[PDB]
Amino acid sequence: VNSFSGYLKLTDNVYIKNADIVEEAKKVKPTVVVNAANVYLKHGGGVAGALNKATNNAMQVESDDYIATNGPLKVGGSCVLSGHNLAKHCLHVVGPNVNKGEDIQLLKSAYENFNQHEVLLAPLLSAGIFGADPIHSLRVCVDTVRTNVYLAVFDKNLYDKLVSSFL
Ligand SMILES: OC[C@@H](Nc1ncnc2[nH]ccc12)c1ccco1
Ligand SMILES: [Cl-]
Numbered sequence: 001v002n003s004f005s006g007y008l009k010l011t012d013n014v015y016i017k018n019a020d021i022v023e024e025a026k027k028v029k030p031t032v033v034v035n036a037a038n039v040y041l042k043h044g045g046g047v048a049g050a051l052n053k054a055t056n057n058a059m060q061v062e063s064d065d066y067i068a069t070n071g072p073l074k075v076g077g078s079c080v081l082s083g084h085n086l087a088k089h090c091l092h093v094v095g096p097n098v099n100k101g102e103d104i105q106l107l108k109s110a111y112e113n114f115n116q117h118e119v120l121l122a123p124l125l126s127a128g129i130f131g132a133d134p135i136h137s138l139r140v141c142v143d144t145v146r147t148n149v150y151l152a153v154f155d156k157n158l159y160d161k162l163v164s165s166f167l
Contacts, residue, residue, distance in 0.1 A: 002119060003028050004150045010166055014142050014149050018159035021047055021123055021152040022054045025086040030150075033083055034114070034122035035059075036130065037092035039072040046129040047154075055084040063092070075102050076109030091117060098131030107137065111144040119148045128154070138162055 007015035017024075025033045036047040041063035043052035052059040062081055073079060078093040095110040096102035110125050124141065126132035141149065153159050 002148075004030075004121075007150055008163060010138075011142055013146060014151065016138075016151045016159070016162065017153065018156045019152040020050075020154055021121065022050050022086070024152050025051075025083075025121060026054070028121060029087060030083075030119065030121040031088045032091050032117045032120045033087035033089075034120055034125075035090050035092045036123050036125060036128070037073065037078075037094050038097065039075060039077075039094050041067055041073070041092060047123045051086065051090070054086060058082075058084050059090065076106040078110075078113035087121070091120065093125060095125035095130055095137075096132070097129075098126065099129070104132060104136075107132065107140050108144050111141055114141075114145045114149055115147050117147055119150075121150050121152060123152060123154070134158055134162060135165055138166065 007017045009015055035051055043049055043060050066081060073094050075094050075096055078091055081090050081092060083090045093110050093113050096104055096106040107126050114120055124134050124137040127134040127137050
């Protein structure tokens with residue numbers, strides 16, 4: 001039993017809700033919130049900009065130190081950093097950004113990072129401003145993640161499209 005509420009159950013391990021991931025994290029305080037990161041951990045827009053804003057820029061300050069020490073992430077890769085006021089941990093995961101010409105096949109690799117955590121609150125990787133098809137992202141999620149994932153989503157109209165189209 002966990003404290004996630006109002007989710008539709010898609011499979012044994014994947015749940016989905018129309019929700020603002022910032023507000024969801026602030027309510028649930030999950031062990032892990034997933035950020036839709038880029039390799040530079042520059043949290044400018046989309047989910048990343050919103051999560052960082054909610055931390056009063058502390059996420060960005062921590063991220064800049066991480067990059068200065070370690071260099072950029074790989075597309076498809078991840079790192080675990082603080083969850084600040086939103087969660088215990090933030091798993092920063094880099095899905096391919098189609099608006100940069102990155103290989104959509106890397107989306108499966110990106111979702112594999114979720115399997116290192118028993119339970120996660122997450123967005124659909126590579127959706128929104130990363131330019132991939134969200135129906136595809138949900139399919140890859142369901143076919144790749146084996147741990148318990150709670151997907152938030154932001155856009156009420158896509159949420160309805162994702163449910164009604166879900167196979
Ligand atoms: O992963 C992309 C996804 N973005 C978010 N999902 C959940 N909560 C959010 N809060 C702020 C942004 C955001 C999206 C946007 C439009 C279509 O898909
Ligand atoms: Cl987005």
